[PDB]
Amino acid sequence: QTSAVQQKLAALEKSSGGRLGVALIDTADNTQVLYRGDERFPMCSTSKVMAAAAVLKQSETQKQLLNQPVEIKPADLVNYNPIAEKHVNGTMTLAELSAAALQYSDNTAMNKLIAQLGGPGGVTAFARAIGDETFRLDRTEPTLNTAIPGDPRDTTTPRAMAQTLRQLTLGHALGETQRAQLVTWLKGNTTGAASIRAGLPTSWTAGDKTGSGDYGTTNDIAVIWPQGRAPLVLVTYFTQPQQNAESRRDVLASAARIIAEGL
Numbered sequence: 176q177t178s179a180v181q182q183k184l185a186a187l188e189k190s191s192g193g194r195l196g197v198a199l200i201d202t203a204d205n206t207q208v209l210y211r212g213d214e215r216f217p218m219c220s221t222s223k224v225m226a227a228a229a230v231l232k233q234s235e236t237q238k239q240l241l242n243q244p245v246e247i248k249p250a251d252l253v254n255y256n257p258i259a260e261k262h263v264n265g266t267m268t269l270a271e272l273s274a275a276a277l278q279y280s281d282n283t284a285m286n287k288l289i290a291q292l293g294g295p296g297g298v299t300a301f302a303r304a305i306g307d308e309t310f311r312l313d314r315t316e317p318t319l320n321t322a323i324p325g326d327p328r329d330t331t332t333p334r335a336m337a338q339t340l341r342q343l344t345l346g347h348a349l350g351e352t353q354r355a356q357l358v359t360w361l362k363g364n365t366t367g368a369a370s371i372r373a374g375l376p377t378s379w380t381a382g383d384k385t386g387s388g389d390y391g392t393t394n395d396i397a398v399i400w401p402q403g404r405a406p407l408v409l410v411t412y413f414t415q416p417q418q419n420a421e422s423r424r425d426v427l428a429s430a431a432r433i434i435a436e437g438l
């Protein structure tokens with residue numbers, strides 16, 4: 176059976192032609208609202224949260240790790256390098272790389288975080304260490320975005336990503352300074368205006384990370400502080416049947432607007 180929330184999300188999905196996955200956690204009472212919440216979806220750049228968090232975890236026992244400069248060579252650049260291109264033949268610290276990955280969705284920056292963690296499997300291992308049994312990172316940028324229907328590579332479920340984002344930002348999967356740093360980064364994201372944020376009441380504070388990829392995959396994950404009530408975590412994943420489908424950030428905004436009703 177469905178609730179009216181789920182029915183609205185199903186109708187949005189039907190109209191969009193694609194496949195929508197939603198998970199809301201309301202931390203007032205730790206209830207969840209799910210739509211396809213246990214189905215896998217391609218994460219695309221939403222995986223950058225796990226990678227940044229994994230580096231923050233490393234920094235809990237190496238307090239200057241975040242300030243460590245990393246060389247950016249010409250050959251490091253991939254398909255979308257808005258920050259890293261400014262530093263070719265220079266450096267970016269792991270903090271600068273995290274900020275670029277999270278706040279600009281820089282793919283070179285993500286590949287440096289992945290390298291810091293020893294490869295995609297290092298990101299997955301961090302996920303398992305914080306109780307995320309679902310996340311898997313298989314590939315680097317840009318191939319982690321191929322988003323092929325049903326392919327389990329580089330996927331998670333909405334429920335698992337919401338539980339993890341709660342643990343990382345409101346819980347204590349990270350140390351105190353590190354959790355605050357992740358929240359600061361997410362809150363300052365520059366790429367999210369058309370996605371979840373566009374569907375929320377404007378008085379609400381939010382941190383988010385978007386993703387996009389082939390098959391018109393359009394994603395966003397957010398930690399949200401509504402005005403006068405306990406925070407929320409919201410995941411909205413969306414993917415489409417044809418490889419060259421257009422982005423649909425508006426679907427995410429719509430999903431958020433549905434979920435916000437009654438909150």
Ligand SMILES: OC[C@H]1O[C@@](CO)(O[C@H]2O[C@H](CO)[C@@H](O)[C@H](O)[C@H]2O)[C@@H](O)[C@@H]1O
Pocket residue numbers: 250251252253283285286287289290294315316
């Ligand atoms: O940023 C370079 C760094 O990224 C990794 C992946 O974490 O490799 C990616 O970038 C290379 C150079 O652009 C690509 O050849 C490679 O296929 C891609 O995965 C690291 O291996 C590398 O140190």
